[PDB]
Every structure is written in C-alpha cells, then in structure tokens.
Design an enzyme around this catalytic site. Sequence first.
Site, PDB file in Angstrom:
ATOM      1  N   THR A  45      60.846   3.249  -8.570  1.00 31.44           N
ATOM      2  CA  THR A  45      60.352   3.312  -7.200  1.00 31.44           C
ATOM      3  C   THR A  45      59.807   1.963  -6.750  1.00 31.44           C
ATOM      4  O   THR A  45      59.079   1.300  -7.486  1.00 31.44           O
ATOM      5  CB  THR A  45      59.243   4.371  -7.048  1.00 31.44           C
ATOM      6  OG1 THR A  45      59.757   5.664  -7.388  1.00 31.44           O
ATOM      7  CG2 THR A  45      58.718   4.396  -5.621  1.00 31.44           C
ATOM      8  N   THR A  46      60.177   1.559  -5.538  1.00 32.53           N
ATOM      9  CA  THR A  46      59.641   0.357  -4.915  1.00 32.53           C
ATOM     10  C   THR A  46      59.336   0.669  -3.462  1.00 32.53           C
ATOM     11  O   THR A  46      60.192   1.198  -2.747  1.00 32.53           O
ATOM     12  CB  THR A  46      60.620  -0.817  -5.004  1.00 32.53           C
ATOM     13  OG1 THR A  46      61.175  -0.883  -6.322  1.00 32.53           O
ATOM     14  CG2 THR A  46      59.911  -2.122  -4.687  1.00 32.53           C
ATOM     15  N   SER A  65      57.229   1.248  -9.414  1.00 28.28           N
ATOM     16  CA  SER A  65      57.569   0.662 -10.706  1.00 28.28           C
ATOM     17  C   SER A  65      58.048  -0.775 -10.548  1.00 28.28           C
ATOM     18  O   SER A  65      57.685  -1.650 -11.343  1.00 28.28           O
ATOM     19  CB  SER A  65      58.636   1.508 -11.399  1.00 28.28           C
ATOM     20  OG  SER A  65      59.131   0.857 -12.555  1.00 28.28           O
ATOM     21  N   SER A 112      64.333   1.194 -12.673  1.00 33.16           N
ATOM     22  CA  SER A 112      63.850   2.428 -12.072  1.00 33.16           C
ATOM     23  C   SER A 112      63.872   2.397 -10.550  1.00 33.16           C
ATOM     24  O   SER A 112      63.378   3.338  -9.922  1.00 33.16           O
ATOM     25  CB  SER A 112      62.429   2.725 -12.559  1.00 33.16           C
ATOM     26  OG  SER A 112      61.912   3.893 -11.946  1.00 33.16           O
ATOM     27  N   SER A 113      64.419   1.344  -9.948  1.00 36.23           N
ATOM     28  CA  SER A 113      64.533   1.237  -8.501  1.00 36.23           C
ATOM     29  C   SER A 113      65.953   0.836  -8.140  1.00 36.23           C
ATOM     30  O   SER A 113      66.569   0.014  -8.825  1.00 36.23           O
ATOM     31  CB  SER A 113      63.546   0.213  -7.936  1.00 36.23           C
ATOM     32  OG  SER A 113      62.233   0.741  -7.884  1.00 36.23           O
TER      33      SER A 113
END
Lengths: 229, 202, 221, 238, 69, 243, 198
Positions: free
Chosen positions: G1-2, G130, G169-170
């Site tokens: 996630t960003t 993240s 994770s992004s």
Amino acid sequence: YSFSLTTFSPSGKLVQIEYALAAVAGGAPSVGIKAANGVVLATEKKQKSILYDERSVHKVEPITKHIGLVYSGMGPDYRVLVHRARKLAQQYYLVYQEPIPTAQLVQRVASVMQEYTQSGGVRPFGVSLLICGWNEGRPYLFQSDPSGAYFAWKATAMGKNYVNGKTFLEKRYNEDLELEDAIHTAILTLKESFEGQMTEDNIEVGICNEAGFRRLTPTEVKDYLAAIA
Amino acid sequence: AAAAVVEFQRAQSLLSTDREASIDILHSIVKRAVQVKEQSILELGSLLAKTGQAAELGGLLKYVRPFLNSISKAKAARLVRSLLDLFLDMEAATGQEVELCLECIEWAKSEKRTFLRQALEARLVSLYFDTKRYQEALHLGSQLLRELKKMDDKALLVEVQLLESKTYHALSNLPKARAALTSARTTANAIYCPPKLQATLD
Amino acid sequence: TTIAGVVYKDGIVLGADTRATEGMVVADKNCSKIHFISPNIYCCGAGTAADTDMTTQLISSNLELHSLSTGRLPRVVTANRMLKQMLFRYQGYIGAALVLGGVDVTGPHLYSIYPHGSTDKLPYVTMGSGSLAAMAVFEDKFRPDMEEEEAKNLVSEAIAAGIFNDLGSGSNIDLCVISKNKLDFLRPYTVPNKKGTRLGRYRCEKGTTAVLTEKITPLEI
Amino acid sequence: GFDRHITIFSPEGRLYQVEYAFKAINQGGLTSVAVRGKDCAVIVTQKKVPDKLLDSSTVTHLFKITENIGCVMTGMTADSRSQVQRARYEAANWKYKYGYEIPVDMLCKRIADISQVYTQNAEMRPLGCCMILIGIDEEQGPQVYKCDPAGYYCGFKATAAGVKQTESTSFLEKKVKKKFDWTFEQTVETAITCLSTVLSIDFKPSEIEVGVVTVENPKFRILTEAEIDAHLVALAER
Amino acid sequence: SKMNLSEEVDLEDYVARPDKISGADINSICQESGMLAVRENRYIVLAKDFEKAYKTVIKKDEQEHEFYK
Amino acid sequence: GYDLSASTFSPDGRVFQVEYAMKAVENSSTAIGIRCKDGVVFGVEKLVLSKLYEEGSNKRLFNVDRHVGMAVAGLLADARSLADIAREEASNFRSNFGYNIPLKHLADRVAMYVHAYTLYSAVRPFGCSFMLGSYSVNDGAQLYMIDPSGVSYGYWGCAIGKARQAAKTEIEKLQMKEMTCRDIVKEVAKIIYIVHDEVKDKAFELELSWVGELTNGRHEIVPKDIREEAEKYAKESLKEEDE
Amino acid sequence: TTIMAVQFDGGVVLGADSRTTTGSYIANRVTDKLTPIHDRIFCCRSGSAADTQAVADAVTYQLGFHSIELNEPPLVHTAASLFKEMCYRYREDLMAGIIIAGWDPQEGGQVYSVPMGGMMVRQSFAIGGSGSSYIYGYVDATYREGMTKEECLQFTANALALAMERDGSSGGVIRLAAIAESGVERQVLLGDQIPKFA
C-alpha cells in the site's frame, strides 16, 4: 413498572382482556375461509379519503412464503405483532431449516400475546389475528386472540359485525369449497356488512395454497368483485 | 403491446366511423398478450351485442372457451358470465342459446365454480321457460331449489321460485303455481327483495 | 475449495466446485457450495464448511425478514454489508471466504468478502484453495461485457482449472446464473470426473457374517 | 378505572391518552400541509414569530432527516425535536447497516413502531407530535408519508396536520379529485393556496416555510424568502 | 323535484356517501344549494352549489382516529 | 387527566406538570440576555434574600464552557444540575470531535436532556429555564433559551423569570442588532433596574457578564469597573425617569 | 500500500496505489484505497484492509450523523478527530494507518495523518503505507511551498509511481482525487499516464 396491569376482577374475569376484545370487535371487518385446496383472508381496507395512498400500509401481510396474516383491531399493534411473527418464523427456520409450521407460528404469536397480558408495564394487544398457512399438504386457518388463545377455524369473521359474519359463514360454508369459490364467499361475507360500494382498492384479499401465500393484487380483486357483483 | 394499443385505437376509430371494420380488426386481434386478447374479446362481444348478431358471438364463445380458460385467469367466469349476459340481454330466440348456456354450465362444473353454476342454471330455467320447454324448466328449477335451500341466499331462490310459478301457471294450471308463488313470497319476505325482484313478485 | 464469480453484460454468473475434505480425505463429493441469500442473490462459500453455511443462512434469514418488511427486492450492497460487518465482529474467527453476487435494481454486483471482514467489489473474483488457478483463468481470458454462454464457459473453465490443478477441489462444477429475469441454478453444470467404472460384481455370497444376537422388533405402522 | 395511562383500554377500547396526544398535536397551534406531484413533493407550514425578539431563523418546523428526506413537525415542539433526532438516528443507522438510503416508508415505519411502543407501555406517554416525511423513492417517485403519536403511518398523496387539519384535508381532497398530475410549480402553488385558503390569510414570504424534493434534484431544500416570495407573487397574479 | 336543477347535478354522488344524516339534513342540503344559487343570482342549482351546500351542512367530520381500525 | 405525572396527558392534550415546572420558573427574580452584533450580554437580578450572604453567593451565571455561558432562572438546584449536564456535554463533544461545541448543538443536546426528564413519570421536569450565550468568529454571536419543556429557541433578546414581559418590552425598545457589547451592558443594567420591583423585593444585586469578540469568544464576568459604570448608568436613568 | 495526500492553496489532492496483497498474492489489483467520508473529506487507508474498512464505515456514519445534526458541512479536523479517537482507543485491536484529507469552508485544504497508534497531526503533505519509505525522502526533497493544483497532481503521481515501482506490496493503477471548492474530481493513471523513470 414490573406490576401487571391485567389482574383478575372480583368476579374472576380479566377485564383488561375483555376491553382488548371490545377494541378488536370495534375494528375493521375481516374474514378467513379455508377451502379444500387453500385459504383466503379478506378484510375491509376502507380509507377516510382518497388522499390516503392505499398501497403503502397493507392490511394483509405475508409472514413466510406459505403463511399470511390479517388482523382486526389496532393497526400499530398489528404491525408489532406481524414483525414479531416474522422474527419467530425466521428463528424457527434458522434452528430447523424448514419453514415454520402454521400451528407453531400461531402458538408462538399466542405466547407473545399471553406474555404481554401477564407482564408488568404493558397492555394486551388490541388486535385479533387470522393466520393462514399451507404447511404440509393441508390448509390451516387460526384465530389468535388478545388473551393469547388460538382456535383453529374452518371459517370465521372478526370485526364490527363478526357475529353476523359467523352466522353468514355457517349458512354459506361447506367443506367441499374450492379456493376460487371460498374467495367469492369471503368477499360476499365482507359485503354483508360493507357500508358503501365495494371498490377493488377499498378491499384487500390474500390467498394461501400450494404455491404459497400471496396477497391478491387490486386487478385480481377487481376481477373477483366483477364476478361477484 | 404497443401494436396492440395502436390497433385498439384503430378499432375504436372504426367503431366511430364504420363498426364492421373495427369488429373485423377485433377478430383479427383475437385470432392473433393475454390481456390484449381478453380485452378485445370484451369489446367485440359488446359490439356484437349492440349490432344484434348472434351466431357470430356464439361461435366466439365456442372458440374462446378452451383458450379462455387455459391461457390465464381461472376466474374466467368473469368473461363467461359477461358474454352469456350479452347474449341474454340481446335475446333473439336463435335456438343456440340453450346449448350455449348448457355448455357454459358444464364448463363451470368442470372448473368447480358453484355460484356461477347456480346463476347460470337459474337463467337456464328462465331460458327453458321462454322457449316453452316447461318440463325441463321444472326439473332443473326443482334441482336448483333443492341446492339453494341448503345454501341459503334466498335471492336466486326467490327468482327460481318465481320462474317455477310462471311455468306452472303456463302448464299445470294454478293449484301448483299458487303454491310456488306463495313459497316465493314467503322466501322474499325474509330478504330485501331489490326493486326488480319485488316488482317481479308483485 | 474453488469458488468464483464474474459479472457479464446482463447479470452475473457464480461457479463453485463440489468437494468437502474433512482433513486430507474427500469427505463429500457433491457438496453444495453455492448458498441462497435471496431470490436475486447467491453466495459461494469456502473455508470452514459449517461456518460458511451458518453465516450464509443467518444472512439469508435476515435478508428475508428485511425484504418482508420493505416490500422491495433486497440488494447485494445490503448482503455484503451484513456479511462483512458480522465477519468483522467475529474477529476473523468466523472463517468464511465468501463470493457474494446478486442482481438488484442497480444492476449486477459481485463482492468478495474475506474472513476478517474485508470486501472487494470486483468484476470477477475467485476464492478458496483453487482461487489462484481460477484467477489465472480469469486474468487470462476475461473481457468486459461478456454474454451469457461465454461467461458460463469462462466460469466453468476457471472452476475446472481449480479442480484439476488443485488438491482438495471439487469433482463436479455447479453454476448459478443470475439476471434481471432468470435465476438458473445449474447443479451440476458438468462432471469432468465421474467414477472409475468398477469392474464386474465381486460381492460375497448370501450370508457370510453370522450374528451373536437378533432383536427383530415388528413396530406398528 | 384508569384513563390516566395508556395501558388500560377504557371499556370499549378508546385509548384516551393516545386521543389526548392527538389533542396535544392540535393544541400545538400551527398548521402544516403536504402535497406530492408527478415528480415533486412539497411541505408548507405556517411560520409564527410573535416577538421580533426571536431569531426567526431558529423558529423552524422543517427539518432535514437526511440529505434526501425532509420532514415537517406539528404539535409540541420539544417532542417534535426529539422525534426528529430519533428519525435522523434511525436513518443514519439504516444507511450504516444496510448500505443504502432509508426509504421514507421504512423511516415512518420505524418512528411509528417507536410511538406504538410508547402507547403499549404505561411508563411513557405517547409524545404528542405529528411528523410528515417527504422524499424521492427510486421507484415509487415522490413519497409523502405522515406518522402520528398512535403509531399510524399511512402514506398520503396530500395531507395536513395541525389545528386546521380537517379543512386542509378537505381542500386538498377537492383539489385532488381533479387532475392530480401536478408539476413542481403547480404542486407548490396547490400547497401554498391550500394553507392560505384554510387560514384565511394572505401570506407574506415571511410567515411560511416551504420544503421541496424533486426527482431532478432529490435533495430536501428549504426554499428561501426570495423563492417563497416569487411563488406567492405568481399565486397573487394568477 | 320541487326545485329546478341543472342536468349536471347527479344526486347519486351525494346519496352514495357514508354519512348518517336525516331527512331534515337532506332538506337542509338542498335548501343551502338553493340559497347559494340565489346568492349567485341564478335560478338553476348547479353541482357547484350542491357540493358547497353539502360541505357546509354535513360538517360532522371530526375525530375517528385511524389507529382504532 | 390529572397533573401528578409527566406521563399523563390532560383531557386537553396538555401535560400539566411541565406547566407547573414553568410556573416554578416564573418565580425567580429575573434574567435578561441581549445578543448584540459582536457578542452576548447576560444580566441577572440576583435578589439578596438576606444580608448574611456574600455577593455572588448564589451565582445564577455559570460558565458551561470556554465560549458558552448560561444564565438560569428558577430552582437553583435544578439549574446547577443542568449546568453540570451542559458542562459534561461540552466536554464530551470536545473530547470526541476535537473542537469547541457549537452553541446551537449544545443547546439542542441540553434541551433534549430536559425533554428526556419531562417525558416519563419516574422523574419530574426540571424546574428551571436557562439561556445560553456564546460568541465565535466563524459563527457570530448566538443566544438560545431553553425552558422546562425542553424548547430551545434562538433569540436576539430574551428574558426569563418574574418580569419577563416587562424585560421583553424594555429589550424591544432597543436596536440590538446594531449595538456593541460595551453599550449593551449599560442597556442590560438599565433594563434590570427598570424591571426590578423595589417595593416588592427591595434588596437587590445585579450580576452581569458577556461573551463576545472583545473577550475572544470567551465567557467572563463583567469587570468590576464596567459593572459599576453600568450600575451608575441605570441609577441615573431611574433618577431621570423619576424627575 | 502507498498513499499520499498533499495540500495546495484552496484544496487538497489525494493519491493511492491500487494494490492489496494477502501475502505475495494480489487479492485485488484495482483496489480503491481512497474512501470518501462525507462530501469533501477523503481517507487513504493502509494496513489491515478489514480494520481500515470498518473504521472508515464507522467514521462515515458518525460524521454523517454529526453533519446532519449540525446542519453544516463537517470539518476535516472533525473527521480526523473521529478517526484518531477510534484508532487510539482500539490501538491493539486495529492495525490501520490512515491519511485524512479534504476541504471545508472554515479552514479548507487540510491534511491530517493518523498512523497506526492513533496520533493526529496536520501536515502540508502526508505519506503512508508499506511503500511510504521508498519515496518519503524523495517527496521531502521535491516538495516546496506554493504548489498549485496540477503541480500537486504531478507530484503525487510521480511519488506514487516511484513507490509502486520500488515496492513489492504496492502496484497497480494510481487513483488520484482532487478536492476543492467545486467538489471532488477523480482520475486514474492506468499504464502510461503513470510516470516512468529510467
């Protein structure tokens, strides 16, 4: 409060329940007739002006896909009782994945009425209910009373002229009726006491057969009224 | 649906101008949705009632009965009664009336309708009397009286007893017509007797 | 388990495999993994079988009561909200990987609800052990606004991929196609693997294990 | 025995305390009228500010239950505000729980059930206020409903509450006998002229509050003084 | 029968109403309709006149709470 | 319909115990509140019942919050209870949402509390009516009045107590919307002195306060010098009227 | 996630990647991290998807009820305060960072960052997720006072693109949302509208 407001009178009668019965008898007429292949619950849905949109508050309500219910008495009490009956049917289904038998549903609604007769700060429900159902392969018509007593009926009427309706049903009713004929009988019984021209909207009817309980639309009620005129 | 409505107003305009074209269009619609068909049957039956044609409308009954009952509205007693009453207010003594009424009564028996059956049987005894089949009128009226006595309504009962009184007046002199009239008056005294029934009694 | 769903032009199509494995052995061969939430809403279940069954049953009952009260056809948004809120209430301990899908007044909707309560409103979803293979098939040959038959075939292919390439996945494929008008519940849609076609009869004779006691009781009818 | 609390059924029915709640609603002193057109729903209400010291901006019987549902309250003002807060809470809870805006019929059903509980139990009194809800339903169009302290919640094509409830109902009855297909301006004018005729008053833009919901703009809007004046001037000219 | 009504009256709509009104009430309704006709300076009574007269005379409408039924 | 419980409706649909609470309200001395253009000024005709009490021994002006001040009239016990309730409402609002409670919202919450108590028979209506006043830069100057029935209405100038009608006429004889607080203070002192009934109560003290822009949206008691100047203005006004 | 939310004169602009991984597998490729709260307030979610969605729904309900009661548009500070109360009370139960950002008439153009733990602090630009770290220094280097609307949009697109490209994770698309007087305008950078480096 926690103290019951329904207590035995010096003559051994529950005057509160008697007065609830009077309130019921003062309500709109309703008739329930069980035929050989189904049941019909008809009721007077006369409004006090054409302003009243007679499509929002329904006098006859379904509680399950095989159980319907009409009333005579107080509209709000009917609303709370129909909501409670729906909840009881859903609880029964969840416990036993099987639609609640009509006898069980009327038993539990009657228990609710009895506990509102017994409880402390409350009032007996001012409605009498006319549950109809098609559990198993048989039709069931039950009348539940403000006292919490339920009677199985071949055919009955409750409301303003309920004694006259019951006499009319005794004269006109036979065990061999068929659903479309019992609908005729129910509408005719309602006409026996109806005060004015019986339009397809100021009356409401709901049938209950193998397919399941369904409230007849104003179009079908209009066709029945035309056939009965 | 839209085409059905368009041809419906076409039939209305042809009713206004020359009724025969509208009637033919209504037959075309019937030959050709269930609401459209039943509605068009109603209008064309009314049109034939107005125009006085009887054989065509009897053929319409013969044709519709199967489709009428099968397609929808097991309460098709509506249309059956409507068309019979169109005949029987357009009384023409065409002979086919008795057969049509008997066919409708048998259809009602099959459908298990009882008040429709009894009303049709009452007006059937009326037809028998009007066509001079007094014995058949008397038998059917007696059966209908025995039914309506146990199923108490008293109105069709008074009508049937008046028809029996008239039949006896025509056939068996007046030791029995008087008794039937007395029974009709006594039965009527226990109900409202709408003005038509009261005037018939009087 | 292998459940999936995809929204096509006129509605949605859900597809589940048929197997329940109690541990590492095939407990059931014809487990119904698609549950009736509402006339227009069905939910595929994965994870703990009893947990999914009871969750979907509770929400179906709640939605039946809600529809009876409203007089209107329930909505997939309502179903998804109920499922997600309850699964979040039970801190992911109500293990029920759900693929909810329905067709309400506001078009067709398809959500993927996870045990912890997180939801995703995606055009196509896959969940269960074979979710990876089913999503491979979807990402491989999915395009927007599919037709009835091609959507059916796509979901069948995805569930078949899960069945074949995943252990503990179903034997037959069940589908449910929901549209504004029709609610077809194809059970089974296909039977990729039927049985081994046992050889000739090998039964023993008539009477091969005698008894220590007999208690025949002629009960009344 | 006891017509002092609800739970007694004076010996023919006749819940006297509920009847007294209705009498209180009338005793509130104000009148409100509600109408619905082909695509619009309107609620007008008399606005009385007999001080010149009152803000006259806080004296309002028009409330916004949610962005798409409005209401006009009649009767005791404290009870009106309490029921309005309850309605707002119920609407917000419905949105949070089911994911879509609460229908007007369901909202009136909730408040009517609450009032029924008040009449069923003896500890409480049936709070004496009449609520008239207005909203645009996605399929039923401009829903207009009215809940009363007994638990009755019938939906109306055009209704009224207050001291002149009967006369307003009769006037709206006469109007709806003929050509009930009302445009937005037609229905606003119908409501305003109904109130004016029943009250025998020529309305300034000041002493009335008008709330409107339209299909094109399904947001409960309280018309400003300028818009009310425009409608009143058009009415006078016609 | 003693009055001169316009052919648009159709007294049936007034007859078929759920009101418990006496013969004196019916006479009052007709009398008030005639009075309205005289007021407007007409010698023929209209459906407007009968509507207004009926609403003016039969004003018993009050109460009948809807929750009792 | 008797009047022994708030759960009972009169045959007229009129809850009588709430009216008795209001009757108790219109027995306290008096309390005016005037909403100027840039603030709100409260004044109370605090009747010193005995000379034994200290000045400010029965404060009828409470600080419900930094920016909100209430003037009460009626039963002081009930007024203090309502002041505590309003204080906790403001504290809870600030803790939950993170900014000073709007006066309209606080008045609505407290009025709904008063309605909660006027509903049932297990309790009795509050025997005090109060006025709330606040000033904020982004919301102007606001004055509300809440009565035993729980009716919160905004005002430009309001009066509660015995001589509420006389105070109302005196307030109506003002251009409140266009005056400044520094002068509305003198006007309020004048109104208090005019509506005070010397022959009926004799002993008398004036308790003033305002919340306005000059106080940065903060409720405070009037400084001693300002209060003395306003009192002198009222005295000279009375002298001039007598002459 | 960003997730990023950067402030400009007269409004704010929010941006987020559209990835949601249950481990190394992307459960959702087109996730909508941005979540409207009332009308102009938005929250960028990060961490536990379930916790973030639940708290977002609860705060949406609370803020809607509050705005209805007040009859005024809710403040961005008020929404951030609700989020912070919920997170700080349920620190141990929740694992969710959030970036509240929006516009209100009183003090329009606000950005608050409520990381996990539940501390509410206003910022000119807020970063989270993240992939936050991989671009947090870059945004510190490239940010300057006086950003305009389109320049803020470009800044957010570049920062999120870098975070997405360097963070496992992004990934996915970049969902941006500009909030101001006029309202909220959304947009998505899919495959080529996403800025590319090297």
